[PDB]
Every structure is written in C-alpha cells, then in structure tokens.
C-alpha cells in the first residue's frame, strides 16, 4: 500500500470526491495524521454513536434507565428498522434501542431515542455542552442522510467527530459503566464489524460504526490498534462522488489498509 496521504489522494482523484480523515490516540487525543479534518461532511448513521452517548449521559444523571421499556406504534416506524419492526407488541428497552441503532443501524430505534434527548436540537445542545462547537444534527431519520452540497445540516468534521467520541469514551463525562457500554456497542456492530475483522491482520482490535448517504456519502468511525487494544480513533468520511457503493467501500478499505500498514508509534 502507498503511504496514507498518497492513498487518500489517489482515492479522491479516482472517485472525483472529497475524503476527510483523522487518526487520533484515544488516550491523549494526540493527532497522528489528518486530511481535510476541519472540513464538514455528513455524519449519516455515524451520529447514532453520539446519540447513544447522550442517552448514557441521561442515565448517568438519573434521568433515564437502559432498562426503561419503550412502547411504540407502526406509525412511528421509518425506513430500515430491522429490529424495531419486530417489537411492535412488546416494545424495546432504551438499552436495546441503542444496540439496535448502533449495532444494526436501525433507524426507528434512532428516532425513538432522539425524541428522548429532545430531538436534533437537544442532541446539538449536548454536543455544545461537551465542548463540540461544530457537529450539528438538525433532522431525523431518514432525512438526515440527504447530503446536499454545501448544506451544513447533520454534518461533522473528522477532527470534531474524533474529539467528541474520545470525550464520550474517556473523559469524566460518562460514568465508567456508560463508557464501557458505549464502547461495547461499537464492538458489537453487526453491519461492518465482522467483515472488517475478517480482513484485518491478526492482532488488530476493531470497533466501529459506518454510515452511507446520498451523493456518494460514505463513512466510518472506529476504534483500532495493534496488539488487541483500542489504541486510536480513525474517522474517514467521503462525500460528493457519483461512484458505486462497491467502489466507495473499496476506497475506504484501501485508505484503512494504508493507515494500518504505515502505522506509527
Ligand atoms: O500491515 C501489514 C499487514 O498487511 C497485510 O494486510 C493488509 C490487508 O490484508 C488488508 O486487507 C488490510 O486492510 C483491509 C481492510 C481495511 C478496512 C479498514 C476500514 C476501516 C478499518 C478501521 C478504521 C479504518 C477504516 O490491511 C493490510 C494493510 O495493508 C497482511 O500482509 C498482513 O498479514 C499484514 O499484517
Ligand atoms: C446510516 O448511514 C443509515 C443510512 N442508510 C441509508 C443509506 O444507505 O443511504 C438507508 C438506506 C435509509 N435512508 C436514509 C436515507 N435514505 N434512506 S438505511 O441504511 O437506513
Ligand atoms: C431490513 C429489510 C427490509 N427493509 C428494507 C428497507 N427497509 N427495511 C428486511 C427486514 O429485516 O425487515 N431484511 C431482509 O429480509 C433483508 C433485509 S432488508 O434490507 O430487506
């Protein structure tokens, strides 16, 4: 593989699209390498990780319980609800909703949860309170994946998403059990985890959340590192390319490959 930024260029040139990337130490926030890290990109389903971060914050403040059962109707469902569509009679706990939303990318589960923290407004307030002054959620599923050119709604920057995930996973913002729960959800991803784990070299830890949207929007936020440890946060977004999903998948894999092959101390 080529060096990581060389691979990143090649990808932008082949896709005719923008790539954004940061590789950061989870423990300190040391930035190892970055590319359009301060440019905005639609978050897509990657926001589900931050959303469950806010739910955990509510559980920690005594405002919410992972066990609280929520009951919802058929009329509340939205597109792609592989888990939530199966529990119309029995409802789902707040904890199950976060696992469906992060590990299966269930969209109704995300919506039901979004209502509990005050909707997109309330999730943007939580970010501001955590010191993220860039990320902004403004719409619900599935409209938040719309990705129009130059629209800042429902977008983040690579470096702002990395700094926020680091704060949720390691500062004293979430209790320790909550930090561990947020982490375990991403480890248990069922959409791309297994696939990715199977092609990674032996020794590599992987936790992730992937997303896709319109106009070629594609992305992943992940915990990765050699020696079976969640060493660094890697955030890769792609936007404004006409390419097929398969090509978009391969290009992000090729950058991931480059990143992994040329990993620095
Ligand atoms: O780094 C050296 C290694 O190079 C090869 O592995 C390749 C290759 O087998 C590939 O499949 C994979 O990435 C493929 C999948 C990348 C998916 C990453 C996408 C996500 C991953 C986590 C966040 C970044 C983006 O890595 C490497 C690096 O060249 C193998 O020889 C392996 O034995 C060896 O240990
Ligand atoms: C996370 O990224 C959820 C988005 N997926 C979209 C998509 O692939 O673009 C689906 C198909 C739902 N949706 C959003 C916009 N249009 N449909 S699905 O994965 O929920
Ligand atoms: C999620 C699904 C229905 N679907 C499509 C769009 N929104 N919902 C359906 C299900 O589990 O309900 N699954 C299949 O069966 C394959 C997948 S799916 O992607 O066909």
TrEMBL record:
NCBIfam families: bla_class_A, SHV, SHV_LEN_OKP. This is Beta-lactamase. It is an enzyme of class 3 (hydrolase). It comes from Klebsiella pneumoniae. The lineage of its organism: Bacteria, Pseudomonadati, Pseudomonadota, Gammaproteobacteria, Enterobacterales. Pfam families: Beta-lactamase2. Its EC number is 3.5.2.6. GO terms for biological process: beta-lactam antibiotic catabolic process; response to antibiotic. PANTHER family: BETA-LACTAMASE, BETA-LACTAMASE-TYPE TRANSPEPTIDASE FOLD CONTAINING PROTEIN. It catalyses: a beta-lactam + H2O = a substituted beta-amino acid. InterPro entries: Beta-lactam/transpept-like, Beta-lactam_cat, Beta-lactam_class-A, Beta-lactam_class-A_AS. It comes from the Bacteria. Keywords: Antibiotic resistance, Disulfide bond, Hydrolase, Plasmid, Signal.
């Amino acid at each position: 593989s080529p060096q990581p930024l060389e691979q990143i260029k090649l990808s932008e040139s082949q896709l005719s699209g923008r790539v954004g990337m940061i590789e950061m130490d989870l423990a300190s926030g040391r930035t190892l390498t970055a590319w359009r890290a301060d440019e905005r990109f639609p978050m897509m389903s990657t926001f589900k990780v931050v959303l469950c971060g806010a739910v955990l914050a509510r559980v920690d403040a005594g405002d919410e319980q992972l066990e609280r059962k929520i009951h919802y109707r058929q009329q509340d469902l939205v597109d792609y609800s592989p888990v939530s569509e199966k529990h119309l009679a029995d409802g789902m706990t707040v904890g199950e909703l976060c696992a469906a939303a992060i590990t299966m990318s269930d969209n109704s589960a995300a919506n039901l949860l979004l209502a509990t923290v005050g909707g997109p407004a309330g999730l943007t307030a939580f970010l501001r309170q955590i010191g993220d002054n860039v990320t902004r959620l403004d719409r619900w599923e599935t409209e938040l994946n719309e990705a129009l050119p130059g629209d800042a709604r429902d977008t983040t920057t690579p470096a702002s998403m990395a700094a926020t995930l680091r704060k949720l996973l390691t500062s004293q913002r979430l209790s320790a059990r909550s930090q561990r729960q947020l982490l375990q959800w991403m480890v248990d991803d069922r959409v791309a985890g297994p696939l990715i784990r199977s092609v990674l070299p032996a020794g590599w830890f992987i936790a992730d959340k992937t997303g896709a949207g319109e106009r070629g929007a594609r992305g992943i936020v992940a915990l990765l590192g050699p020696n079976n440890k969640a060493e660094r946060i890697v955030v890769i977004y792609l936007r404004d390319t006409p390419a097929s999903m398969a090509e978009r998948n391969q290009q992000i894999a090729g950058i991931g490959a480059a990143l992994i092959e040329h990993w620095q101390r």
